[PDB]
Amino acid sequence: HWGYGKHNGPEHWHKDFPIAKGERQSPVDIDTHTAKYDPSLKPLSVSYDQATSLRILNNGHAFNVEFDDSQDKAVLKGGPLDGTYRLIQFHFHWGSLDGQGSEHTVDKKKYAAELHLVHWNTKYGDFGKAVQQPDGLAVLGIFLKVGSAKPGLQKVVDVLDSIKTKGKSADFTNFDPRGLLPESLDYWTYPGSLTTPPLLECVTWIVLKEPISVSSEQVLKFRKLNFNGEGEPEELMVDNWRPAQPLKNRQIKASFK
Ligand SMILES: [N]S(=O)(=O)[C][C][C][C][C][C]C123[B@@]45[B@]67[B@]89[C@@]1%10B81%11B698B746B814B562B%10%1143
Ligand SMILES: [Zn+2]
Numbered sequence: 001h002w003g004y005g006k007h008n009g010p011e012h013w014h015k016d017f018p019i020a021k022g023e024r025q026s027p028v029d030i031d032t033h034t035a036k037y038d039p040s041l042k043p044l045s046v047s048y049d050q051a052t053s054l055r056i057l058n059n060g061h062a063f064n065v066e067f068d069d070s071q072d073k074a075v076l077k078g079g080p081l082d083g084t085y086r087l088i089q090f091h092f093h094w095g096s097l098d099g100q101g102s103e104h105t106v107d108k109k110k111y112a113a114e115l116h117l118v119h120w121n122t123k124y125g126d127f128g129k130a131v132q133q134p135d136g137l138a139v140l141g142i143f144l145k146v147g148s149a150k151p152g153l154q155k156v157v158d159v160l161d162s163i164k165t166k167g168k169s170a171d172f173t174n175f176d177p178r179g180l181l182p183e184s185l186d187y188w189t190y191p192g193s194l195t196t197p198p199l200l201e202c203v204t205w206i207v208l209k210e211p212i213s214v215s216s217e218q219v220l221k222f223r224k225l226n227f228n229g230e231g232e233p234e235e236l237m238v239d240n241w242r243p244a245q246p247l248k249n250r251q252i253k254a255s256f257k
Contacts, residue, residue: 002197003061003227010242017199024201025245026192027103030252035188038253044185044206045078046140046178051087053175056159060166060227061196062091062240065156065175069120069127074177076119076138079206079255080189085119085138088127090177092116093195094222096238098146103195103241104207106143111211112219113144114241115180116195134191136202142182142212149215152179157221166229182210186256195242209256 002008014020051074055066066089074087094113095101102111117140120130130136155175162170186209193201225237
């Protein structure tokens with residue numbers, strides 16, 4: 001099955017998922033000089049005050065913090081979006097070392113990690129229907145650099161020991177994702193895809209310019225997770241990022257001057 005190794009990594013995905021070589025694949029390099037300021041873009045509205053986290057899951061490729069998405073409790077709107085998008089989960093991508101780990105790059109710079117807050121368009125009723133639509137998902141991407149600790153991340157870090165291996169989950173209630181946001185909501189946006197199989201071309205990407213800082217100790221704990229299941233040969237969960245894909249016939253727009 002697909003993963004991040006020599007024999008099953010991103011360069012192989014196209015055999016099972018031919019859309020891997022499609023016209024709107026993610027991630028991409030953001031060339032900051034070429035991205036056009038678009039004065040028609042609105043401020044992003046991130047309304048997470050009523051967010052209800054439920055659980056954290058090691059799915060064998062990352063860990064997902066899952067939310068109750070059975071009502072409009074945690075929603076993204078505005079920015080480039082029409083309508084209302086409901087938070088379903090967040091997860092990260094990260095490296096074996098601090099010099100790599102992000103999926104998007106900024107003028108070819110790789111960050112240590114990248115947070116993806118995944119939301120689906122309520123007009124399609126459920127996540128599974130939304131991923132079949134070109135405007136089905138909105139993913140808010142946030143870069144992580146290593147420096148000062150992010151206090152709002154520590155609750156996530158401390159539960160990782162309990163979900164070391166693939167298929168393990170843990171109750172994860174009352175986690176506030178507002179504690180993962182940078183100060184500024186300045187962003188870039190473009191049309192793209194899921195960055196993992198099935199690589200569906202259903203995402204409006206919103207990538208924040210301002211990174212968050214996390215400590216070396218925090219990211220080291222991400223790197224103790226395992227891709228393998230319990231009792232299997234240990235394969236550290238590191239380098240679970242897809243590299244930048246061809247931009248093709250797309251424009252990246254900036255919300256800021
Ligand atoms: N890295 S990222 O932020 O671009 C991606 C996060 C998207 C979550 C989408 C995966 C699935 B799993 B369930 B439902 C969706 B349909 B079925 B299975 B298929 B896979 B696809
Ligand atoms: Zn992701």
